[PDB]
Design a protein around this ligand. Structure first.
Ligand SMILES: CC(C)COc1ccc2cc(-c3nn(CC4CCN(C)CC4)c4ncnc(N)c34)ccc2c1
Length: 458
């Protein structure tokens, strides 16, 4: 069975752990699904084929309201196609920051759902290991929507990326025992404890100016509740967090036992709003998403340098007599040749999607698609479109982060952003000196963009 014989791509949702995720549709039944596409060249398997196939077969039979439903699995020479149920509510934290109030009742209802999901998967001997806020999706845009946990089962069968653009926001949530090599299902309880701590305070329990500093704190395992906003929080919530953030996993509370904890029993069956927490989460989230967007922008610029020259070289080879003109079918053949090697665009997984993409570029530049075309102009527009989309994505993240609409990001804020982005301190300061030549101690959007261009060799 071939994935593209059955499914057509609608639109790219985004890059998640291990691969890009595409909204797809069954060509016969019209069923919509969310397909995670793992490139075999970029991601290495940890287990054999026997093991992976059996896991998939088990997962397809499992069913729980707080776990993503898996429908199908496909494999070809280059990729794995993981076909799951599509959820439309987005990431939990993105919904949380938009609401006016947030209490321990809201938090307890959220955590009960997470613990219920984890409990169920643990009964079936499946461990997540990489549990974090971006793995908590809302089933729909409804106010009361269930949480659906994504990526259960993946870490067991695939090695994680070492690229920082993939490792953003991982260090806060990882259990200490995962760092040293001996771990079991209890690591998921630790990660949920970290998430709970953040839900109630808006600040990570283990924090630092860069990834390795965060990991050092995690490894020591020590945290406190001495921040002012913990005065608002019930002792039972702090007691549960303690039990989930117990260092020795054998002494740490199980997921199933946490469901029976006083705090869950009291607050899920009077309570003020955690206003300081929601403000801190908004800053946390904003900071995290801008760091991610920065890395993705820089990644997109490098992909463009690579793809522009490769696409030009492919068409040069095709252009036999060398007059620079190729027809639409040839442009498709060359663009296929390109996306064939590169694992960048997952929405270009079959010939039909490539035909469509080529037509969109020709329609943008007002070139007639039924005659011969100046390929060098096609390349420029095809790449400039991606450059523009990348620029616009970054800008939206910049505006989101700039919550007072000042138009600026301060040096203190840059340190925070670049710290999360794990860009070396003297490196970004060096680039800031290049861009900020009046010692303003702040950058507008274009200046920020220029700093990022200088941080990826431009
Ligand atoms: C074979 C199993 C162990 C895992 O298989 C799957 C299959 C589909 C998946 C789909 C997603 C997924 N990922 N995403 C979107 C993320 C993609 C990146 N953006 C920036 C943030 C959200 C989804 N949105 C709606 N529904 C979904 N199911 C997803 C995540 C993990 C998945 C794992």
């Amino acid at each position: 069975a071939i994935f593209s014989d059955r499914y057509k791509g609608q639109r790219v949702l985004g890059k998640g752990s291990f691969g890009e995720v595409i909204l797809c549709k069954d060509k016969i039944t019209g069923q919509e699904c969310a397909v995670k596409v793992i490139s075999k060249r970029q991601v290495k398997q940890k287990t054999d084929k026997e093991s992976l196939l059996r896991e998939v077969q088990l997962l397809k039979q499992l069913d729980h309201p707080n776990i993503m439903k898996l429908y199908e699995f496909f494999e070809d020479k280059g990729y794995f196609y993981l076909v799951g149920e599509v959820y439309t509510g987005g990431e939990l934290f993105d919904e949380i920051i938009s609401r006016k109030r947030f209490s321990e009742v809201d938090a307890a209802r959220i955590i009960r759902q997470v613990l219920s999901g984890i409990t169920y998967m643990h009964k079936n001997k499946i461990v997540h290991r990489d549990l974090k806020p971006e793995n908590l999706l809302l089933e729909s845009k409804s106010k009361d929507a269930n949480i659906r946990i994504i990526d259960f089962g993946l870490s067991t069968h695939f090695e994680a990326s070492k690229k920082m653009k993939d490792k953003i926001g991982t260090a806060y949530y990882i259990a200490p025992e995962v760092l040293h090599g001996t771990y079991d299902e209890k690591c998921d309880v630790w990660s949920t404890g970290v998430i709970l701590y953040i839900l109630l305070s808006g600040c990570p329990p283990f924090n630092g100016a860069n990834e390795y500093d965060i990991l050092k704190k995690v490894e020591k395992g020590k945290y406190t509740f001495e921040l002012p906003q913990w005065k608002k929080v019930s002792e039972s919530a702090k007691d549960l967090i303690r039990k989930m953030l117990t260092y020795v996993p054998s002494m740490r509370i199980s997921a199933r036992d946490a469901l029976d904890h006083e705090w869950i029993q009291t607050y899920t069956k009077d309570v003020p709003s955690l206003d300081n927490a929601i403000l801190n989460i908004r800053q946390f989230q904003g900071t995290q998403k801008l760091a991610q967007a920065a890395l993705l922008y820089m990644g997109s610029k490098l992909t463009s340098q690579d793809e522009t020259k490769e696409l030009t070289a492919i068409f040069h080879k095709m252009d036999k007599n060398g007059d620079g003109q190729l027809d639409r079918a040839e442009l498709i053949e060359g663009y296929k040749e390109l996306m064939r090697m590169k694992g960048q665009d997952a929405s270009m997984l079959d010939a039909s999607a490539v035909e469509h993409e080529v037509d969109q570029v020709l329609d943008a530049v007002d070139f007639d698609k039924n005659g011969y075309i100046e390929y060098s102009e096609f390349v420029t527009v095809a790449m400039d479109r991606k450059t523009l989309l990348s620029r616009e994505r970054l800008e939206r993240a910049f505006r989101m982060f700039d919550s007072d609409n000042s138009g600026k990001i301060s040096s203190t804020e840059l340190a925070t952003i670049f710290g999360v982005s794990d860009v070396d301190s003297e490196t970004w300061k060096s680039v800031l000196s290049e861009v900020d030549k009046n010692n303003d101690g702040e950058v507008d959007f274009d200046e920020f963009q220029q700093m990022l261009l200088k941080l990826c060799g431009n």
